[PDB]
Structure formats: structure tokens, C-alpha cells
Design a protein around this nucleic acid. Sequence first.
RNA 1: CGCAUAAAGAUGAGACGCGUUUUAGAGCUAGAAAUAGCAAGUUAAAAUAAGGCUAGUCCGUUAUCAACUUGAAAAAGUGGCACCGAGUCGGUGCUU
DNA 2: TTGTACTGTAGCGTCTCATCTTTATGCGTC
DNA 3: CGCTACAGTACAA
Length: 1278
Amino acid sequence: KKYSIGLDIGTNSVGWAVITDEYKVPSKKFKVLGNTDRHSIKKNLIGALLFDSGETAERTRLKRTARRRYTRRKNRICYLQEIFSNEMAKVDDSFFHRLEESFLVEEDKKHERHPIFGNIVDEVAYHEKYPTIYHLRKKLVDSTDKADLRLIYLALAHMIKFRGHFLIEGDLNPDNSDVDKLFIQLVDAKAILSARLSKSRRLENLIAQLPGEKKNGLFGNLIALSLDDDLDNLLFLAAKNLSDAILLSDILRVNTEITKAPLSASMIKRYDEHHQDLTLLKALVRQQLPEKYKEIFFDQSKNGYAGYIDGGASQEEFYKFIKPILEKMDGTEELLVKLNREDLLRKQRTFDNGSIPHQIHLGELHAILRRQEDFYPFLKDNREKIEKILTFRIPYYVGPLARGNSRFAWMTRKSEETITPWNFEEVVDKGASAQSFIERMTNFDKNLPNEKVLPKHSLLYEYFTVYNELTKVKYFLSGEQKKAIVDLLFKTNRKVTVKQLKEDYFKKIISGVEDRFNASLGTYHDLLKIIKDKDFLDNEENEDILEDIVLTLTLFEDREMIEERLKTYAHLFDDKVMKQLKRRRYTGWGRLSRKLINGIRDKQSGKTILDFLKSDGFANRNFMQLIHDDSLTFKEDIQKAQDSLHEHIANLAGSPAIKKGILQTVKVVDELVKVMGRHKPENIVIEMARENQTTQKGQKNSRERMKRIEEGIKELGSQILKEHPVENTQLQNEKLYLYYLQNGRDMYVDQELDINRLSDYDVDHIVPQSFLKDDSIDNKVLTRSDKNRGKSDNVPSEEVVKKMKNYWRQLLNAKLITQRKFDNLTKAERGGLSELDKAGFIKRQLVETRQITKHVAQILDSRMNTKYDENDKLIREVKVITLKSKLVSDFRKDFQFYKVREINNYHHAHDAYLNAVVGTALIKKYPKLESEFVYGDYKVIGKATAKYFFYSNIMNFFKTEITLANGEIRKRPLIETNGETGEIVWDKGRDFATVRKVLSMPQVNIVKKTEVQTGGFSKESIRPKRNSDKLIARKKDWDPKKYGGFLWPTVAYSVLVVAKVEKGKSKKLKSVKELLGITIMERSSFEKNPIDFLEAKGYKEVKKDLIIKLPKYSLFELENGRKRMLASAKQLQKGNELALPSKYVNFLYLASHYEKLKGSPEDNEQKQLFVEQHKHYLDEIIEQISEFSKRVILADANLDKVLSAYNKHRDKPIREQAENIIHLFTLTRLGAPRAFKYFDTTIDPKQYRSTKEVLDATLIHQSITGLYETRIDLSQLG
RNA sequence: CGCAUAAAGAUGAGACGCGUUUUAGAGCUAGAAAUAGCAAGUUAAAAUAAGGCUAGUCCGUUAUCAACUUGAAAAAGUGGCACCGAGUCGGUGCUU
DNA sequence: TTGTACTGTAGCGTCTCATCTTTATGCGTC
DNA sequence: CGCTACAGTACAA
Ligand SMILES: [Mg+2]
Ligand SMILES: [Mg+2]
Ligand SMILES: [Mg+2]
């Protein structure tokens, strides 16, 4: 009758179990549908549901942004062609048409095969004249001759298409501020521009050039002018010119030849040194090592020069290949020092070109347009249009430019015209769109869902924070006393401690708070420092306009928008002080609204709740009481302020990977309720990933990072805080925190970093994001940009480890970086990335599973109890119970119910059953702890330490004998009782045998969730041309036999077809039954009309009613109970579970972890002799694995290999042997076959690359719990 | 639940630099040639999920998804119990 | 001409802006 | 709180 359900929830598994009051799992005879002979099957009410973990929308967002970028770049090119078309039709009408067909082959082109000029000799002359596009760019910038319009279009389209970063907001003119000769009109900067640019080097070299008459006041070449509102005093012009000079000359090599195109000059310089070094290297290789010439300059697969140009070898790979060849030869000293500087044989389109700003291209484009405006009037007519096309960028607060058909757009448009960069200002309403950029994202108030929350830096919200912490301060404080302490302490100090309170108010004019007050009026002090009017802030009438000021400052960050919103209030303030106020940027919003805290008033008292916090007589209630006190009128107002399950999950925001676990466990609960005849359970047990730790441990794990930086710098004895002071709240920034963690020095290059130019530096992940998802502090490293651009899909190389291993140790012993961070940095010493590094759990699954279990508690408590009364707010029909994993782990570790995850997927169901058993025993044994453990209820040395001790000692009733902390045992009798009632709640007799029997049960309903695969169509790598037909066409008109294409298509689901295929030169319709893979591209076309799609594949007389959709992980059953999961249409997977007996599992868990039990020496000796007397269990386990493999795995050669390896190493110690048998279950583990390894030998997987046997097998349609099945025998079809 | 300090992650927008693919950048000589010697190599165009229609400088890899009967779809409905045992579940007995 | 066996292959590095979450500790609260 | 299908080449019929 009565029963309980226990659940274990992971990111890939949902374990479920049903128990009665006797801790027994029921078994039922379930009906079986389908055409098979079986009509009833006995199944136990215990199992687990396995599924692929849900994916976050990060990758989809990156692909979407890339798609938008490509679309807008093509639109920029289209705008430029639209401008140029009228004049281009005069000189070459087919020119843009030839540029469009440049991808096509000779037969597919509709014009001459030469794109630019349409004939061989002119194209050859053009390429001889300009080897690169940069030669043409420099020629158009510098020369004054009238050039061909096609070359002008080529240059302009080159800089428009590839336009450089927009991280610099100033002008940074390269026409005259480029050259370092600004010093003579300042009073060269060449010295530090050759050396390392840093404050100390600038100071010492400035003293070296000129012993200063004023150390901080030299008025020229100072670090203040190198590294707009600060001009209120009136060296400014020369200061900004020298700043632009030092920045541009850091980006680009110097150009003493005067030109307006420094970038093209630097690229031509790279080309010239590349040509010279190539010729010299060819001569030296031919003269010294003639045998290596063929390998280096012809073999393109050996990372040589042919591999550097024609092959896929990068610059780093080519350098590390060619360094031994260069060092073993003679006369290669300068080439060696160029290779050390990474300046040898460089290309132009390199990885480090991301540092180049868009202003250089803007200057070059402006120079070309100024040169060519006289000859071509239309260039001068719309020079501003071309400049706008190059320089326009959609603001991030506007978003996509949709017309109401995008689920991501929030833009509103004033008019209905098409948006171009020229008329973007007169069409798009930037103010409302900028408002909606923040309003669409900030959350609503929980108590008032209908209206938005306040900013955190609101003055009203800060008065809230103060009086809400203060109202429970006891020495209760009266309202006059609270007013006085606020006036004399909170309005006078940004941070107030209890000592300042004691020695400033109570001395002349405490429990409930610790050493410092959490509440402060930071915004009040900021406006005191800005406005310089305490009376204006203290006035009550101007509260709403101050709130509008805070809202305006928080919503907007652009200067023009802030000034546009701020112009209404300009007649109370002076122009200098709104100019100073508009610099105050606010980020962060509060947890409460304006109406809930100061708009609503009590019906009888008439006060706002903030007034209630200011003065509550002697009661001194806070918001929690004031919303849960029935006497005030706030509770029913909040209550008045307050259908498919898919809708109950559609409205819950957050990561989409929580929805998979939520939906699976709720549907499992629903089906389990349906199975037992619509009878609701007594209580439902939820695995909670929460814990309880010591107060000291929790405070150590939650201390300020500012203290960590202080101890690290003090251990290293650095003075970076003396030069660069900082607070704790300024370390919330990622880049500043990583700069301070590395003591202002770059981690990959031995140089001092610049604190004021962190935007040009990159946050590298030591383990690549392409390899494994890990955004921890142990992985993040701040470094200069070009090095991180070079570290594409790689751990930093061996050379930087040998260079800077001393500094890594220096920071490691300074307690600034952890041991894991050092191991990541020194990963290249151990072989770098490998398959073993790929394995192991990651913390993202932990965070997602915590979110999932919290939502499990909420949704299950909402769904299960759907009844209430007028006096009883909810009838607790079902009690949702959340135990912590520690209690179940201790239950496993104290009564020898060990689990290992390597053997089978039964551990999920066993953990769920143990959850149910422990939860029911705990609620039955202590009904006074019902309100503690059941969700929705509440009971109302450190407190956390006391809670940890109480949760540690609560399980002591399970044990037969309890050993106290003094080493003395205690007696607790075998049969437990409820205490208040003589009811039996735990027997240390029959119930332990029952739980042993359940944990040894062989049949557990393990179900792999069948999913239709969705995602990318194929792998992103575009493969070269070939005669194979497996190449996927990259476009409709692009035949992959000529143009190449993608490979490895992903199939959505497989389809069983029964039709005829014309086989033989004498055509005859032979009937055939086979699986066909429906790829993701063909999914829509197949579901549109399956018959015509199958007819186009060569089939005919297709039995339409016989088509069975077979998604991935579809289950088939064959002889001797052998089951294969359909991985794809051409691949199967292992689908059987090995039910090893519990004694063998306990023996394996005790044999492994041989000397790391950390229990007691008597227990360690007990396990010592226990594993010693039963060493024959290894042979029994090998026999069991061999029998299971011969029955179901059908990998005979690998079986002989593992048997020979076990026989040859049977004299090894028990630790290593048992560890390798733990590794051995990978052969028999359900899922894809994987390559495991024994002691020394490595066993390659046996792949099941044949789906012929499942065409005559028994297809199983398992439900969400697998109890309801529909077996289909496919041999009766066709 | 609010405030404060952690840590690990989510959602959305604007951008950059590469990479890949085909074509253009006349290869020369000895050559019956299979080939061999020599020369050259750095750049550009186009595409960057096939595409879709509400045609937007928009959207297209997230989430949802056992089988059967109704329903365009959404959605709804569909499967006996007790006992004795256990190699992926079996056997025995009542029930309509 | 069609199945099997063994080995290799797979898109990548950031920058600037916003807002959130669930766990851990110190205070009040139900 | 987990963890490969497809490509390409070489042999058996
Ligand atoms: Mg990186
Ligand atoms: Mg689990
Ligand atoms: Mg999906």
C-alpha cells in the first residue's frame, strides 16, 4: 500500500527506486506490447535513466555572432560596390562579376579566368609590380599619379573587409604623430621605444639622458604623459602626440622613410626581409647540406618551408623544426637571432595582426581618398560615406537590427526605412533601445513580479540596507538613537566598525553585529564628494530626483546619453558639477523594488516599511518579520501581488542544461506514480549536493582575495602596492586581479606589464578551452596579446617552461598560485595534453547539478501536494525530503556497502535506493526533525561547527556500537524504536540482510535515453577536392568533386527501410531491408516527404507503414540476452550491464585504496587480513569477466590478450593487480568501446562497425523508467 | 530571505585576428617519357554551417523528443494483485 | 564487387559591454 | 556530479 521513492540526480543520470515501509523493492509483472511472443515480464522497481548531458548555449551564441559578423562584412563590401558601380561600369563592366566568380573553376566562370584585368599579361604585370596588396596600398597612399580605379577599389575593399580592432576610442592620427621625432618640439623617444616600455625604465633612462632638474616636474617625456576632463587647469598637445607616437611605434616597426602608410611600409619590410632570408637560407642549405634541400623546400609534410607555405605548419612549428638545422650550420647567427626574436621569414596575414587598430586603416583610406579625389570626382563627392562604411559599428546596447522577427532583438526604430550606416542616427532610437538593453535583462522583484527592482547604489536602497541591519542591533536601539548613529557615523565614514561606534558615539553621546557593519552609505559619501552639498542629500523633498540621478547613472554609460537624460536637472546644479557627476558610473541592481519598500503603506499606521525600520517603537521589526507579521497589511498585499510542465520550465531562466535533468526526473516521478495505480507516495527523497563544514574552514575558504594578495606580496617582499594602491572591491575585475596575482609581470614573457593598458592584454587559459571546459582561477593567466594569439589549441610550449620555471616556483611558494596551476603551467614537461587529462569530473557539472536538485525540490513540492484548506495553507500529502551526500557516503563506508563507478551503471540505482532507505529511517526515527529535513518547513563554538557536529552524530543510531572521542565504546541495542512510540523503525537484523539482498539484485532497469541528434551538420574542416562521393557539397552549385567539402556528417536518426535495389548489370529488383542514416541537413527534407526522399536514394516500392524511426541509443536484443545500442546507422554500442556480485565489489573496493582508508589501525588490519585470505577472488572475477565477455561482448582476441596479460602478471602485489582489474571493466562497460590498459599492455577497442545483425533482432521501446516496453521483432518484417 | 566575503558557472549584444577550401599569381630546361635537375613560394577574390521567407544589414548547432489510440498541433488517454525464489528476471496461486 | 581490421581525424585565440545563479562561511529573520 | 563516429587504406571472400 504505502511506499516511498528515492532519487539520485546527476548531470547524465537520474537514479530512481521505489521502496515500501519494510525497505523492500517491489517487483511486478508488466504487460508487453508488440508482435513478439512475450506478453509479460517481471521487473524490479529500481533503475536509472542515462542520458547525454545538456549543452549550454555558448557555442550556439558564438556561431550566431560569427554568422552576423560575416553577413555585415558582406554588406559592407556590397555598400562599397554599390558606390563604385556607376564609375566601374565605364572602365570594366564585368569586374565585380569576375570578382564574384573568382571561386569558380575555369569551366564554371562566365568570363576570363583572370579576375582583376581579364587577360594574362596585365595580371602578370600587376603581380610583378605589386607582390602583395600592401605594395598597392603604399603606392596609392604615397604616389600622386592617377591610378586605375580597379586598384583603388581593391585597396579600399581590402581595408574595409579587414578593418582592425575598435578598442581605441581616440583619434590617434598616423599622418604626423607617427614618427618618434616629436621630442624636439616637445622640449627622440627612440631609446625606451627600443628598450622595454615601463615606468622604472623610463625614469632611469630619462635620468640617463638628462639628470633631472625636477624628478616629478620635468615637464616632458614623463610617465604621466605616456602611461579629457583632467584639462580643468586651463604640455597637453605634445603629451597626446607622444602618447599616440609611443602606441603606434609599439604596434609598428619604425619608418624613417616618410610616408602616410606606416602599416603598409612595415608589411613591405616583412616581405623584403622574408625574400632576403629565403634566398640566403636556400644558398646556405645548398652549399652545406644538399641532402636536406629536398626535405625542407619540397616535402610539404615535414614542417619545412614547403610545409610552412603550402602545408599546414604554423610559424611556431616551422621555427622549432628549422632551429636544429640552423644551429648545426655555419654563418647563421643573424638568422638565429631573428628566430629568437620571432622575426624570421614572417608572413603578412599573421596571427598577431589583431593588435592593429582601425584608426591606421582609417588614416590610410583617408590618404588614398585625398590622393585620388582630383582625378575621380565621385570619390570626393562621397568620401564621408566611405569613411563611415569603414568606421561604423553597431552599439552593443542597440543589438540586432531586426524588424520584429528575432527573439534576440530589442531595438526600436523611429522610422521604417532600411538601416544603412549613413542614416543609422536618424532611424534608430538610441535612447529607448539603450534603456531596453538593461531593462530586458535585469530581474523583476520576487515579491512584486510586475515592476522592476531598484539599483543597488540607490540612496533609498542604502537607507534600507542600513536600517535593515541596524534595527536588530542591541547594546534594542530606539529610532532617535538609530537616527543619531547614522548621522554621526554612516554619513561620516565609508566603512564603520563596532570599535568606532563604541569610541565615537557611546563614549560621548553590543550584539547583533560582528566587528564591522555590513551596511554602509557608500553612494551618500560619493555624492558628498561630488555635489559638496550635505543639505541637498539630507533633504527629503529631493529624494525622487536623486533616485532618478542614480537610475540614469546606472542605466547609461555613454557620455551623450547620460548628458541627454541629465539635462532636465541642470538648473539645480552648476555645469562643472554635472560634468564631474557624469563620470560616476554605477553597476549593479538591488533585490527590492521602490514600491515594496517605500510606495506601499500600512492601512492603519500609514507608514512606509522604511519608516517602520527607522522607528518601530520598542518592537524594532525587520522586513522579514514585517512581511510575515499578520498584524500589518503587507502580507495580504504581497499575496495578492502573486498549465503544462513545459511551461513551468520555460519561464525558469538560467542555464538550459538544468532543464534536461529537471524534465527527466519529474517525468520519472510521474511514471512511477502511474505504475503503482495512481497512488501518491508517502515521501520522496532527493539527493542534495549540499554539505556542512567547520566555521573556521568556511571562513578560510571565504576570506578576501585582498588578504591573499597581501600575504603573497609580503612573502615575496614586493612593492607593487606602494606604487599601485588598490582596495578589495577593485579586485572584482578579472584583468586587474590577474595582474596583481602575477605581481605585475607577464607570465609568458619576462617583462613588466602596464596596469593602465590591460585591455591590450589577453587572459589565457593554460589548459585550452578547445580541449576542456575550465574557467577556474587555476587556469586563467593574464598575458600580452600576441603570445596568446600564438597559443591556439595548445598548452604553452617547453621553451617557456624552461625559461620561466624559476618564476613559477617563486610564485608557487609565495601562496599566490596553487599546485594545480603550477601543474597546468608545467604540463608540457609530462607530455602536455593526453587522453588521461581529458578524463575526470569538472566543477560545471557540480554547479549545474546543485541548480537541478534545488529546482527538483521546488517543482516536486509544488506538483505533489495540490490541495489546501482555508485554515491549512497546504496539505502535506507527500513529504519531499533532501538528504546530503555525506550521510549516504558514511552509510556506504560504515556498513561495507561500497560502490565503484567503473563496474556498471547500477551504482546510480543503488545510491537512489540507499537515499530512500536512509531518508525513511531518519524521518521515522526522529519525527521532531521532520521540519528540519522536509522541504517547506523550518524549526523556527560556531553555529556551522555545531550544525556539522549535529549532522555527524545524527547517524549514530544506525551503528551497533559507537566509539566516543575518548576511545571508549558505547552500547546501543539492536532493535531501534521511535522513542515517543514503540514502532519499529530500524532492525539491525532483518533489514541489513534486506539491504544486502537489494544491493545484490542482478536485474536493474538501466535505460539509455534515446535522443534525436541535433547540432552541426558535419565537422567544420573543409577537405580538399577528391573523386569520392562522400564529400558534402559546401554550396548548391559547388560540386564537391571539383571544390572539396565537408566530411563526417552527423546523423539525426536512423530509418529502417524495406524496398528493392537494382543490383547487377542485368537489372533486377532484389528485395532488401537495411538501415539508412538521416543526416541533419536531410532531416527536414525527409520529414517533408519520406517516400520521395527514399526514392531519390535509389529505393522503390518502399513499404511506407514499415518505416521505423530509430534514434541514437535505440535498443536491440539478440540471442543469449545480448543487447546492442544503435550508436548510428553504421555503428553499434555495448548495451548489456555486468551484474557482479556484491562480495566481489566489496573485495575490489577494499583491495584498492590499500593504505588510504584513514580510519583506525584495527580496521586497517581487519581489511588487511580480509583481502589477504581471499586472494582467489581475483581469479573468480577474471572468470566472471571472461564468461560475460564470451557471452555478450564477442571480442575474442582482446579476451585472449587480457587472459594472457593476467596470467603473465599474476605474481604482482594486490594493489596494482586490483587497480588493473578496476581498469579491466572498460571492456564490459556499457556504451562505446574504449581503449583501456593493463599493467603494461594496451588493449585496443573492438569496434562494432556492422549493423547487419540488428536487422533481424528484437527492437525494444523502453519507457522513461523502462518498466513499460513494446518489443518489436524485426525478422517478421519484409 | 536581506546585507558582506568566497568560489564555480550561466544569458544576451558589439567587434578583431587567423585557419580551411577553389580560383588568379604564364614555371624553365633535358626530355619518347615513366621522370630528373633548376627556379619560385609571403598575396588577393569568394564562401565560412546546406539554406529559409515574414526579405530583415533577420533567422538557421540551446532547449523539447520510448511505443500505440485520439488530436493540424498543443494536449489527453492506454498496461492486475499476492507469495516463493534469483544471472539481467523466473516460477506458483486468485482475478476479470 | 563486398565485408572486416587497423590506424588516423576532428576550427582556434581573444577584446569590450551588460546583467544573473547555487553553493560555502558571519550577522538578523520566519 | 563522464568520457567517438567516421575516413582511409589494406586484404579475405
Ligand atoms: Mg588563450
Ligand atoms: Mg548518479
Ligand atoms: Mg539537442
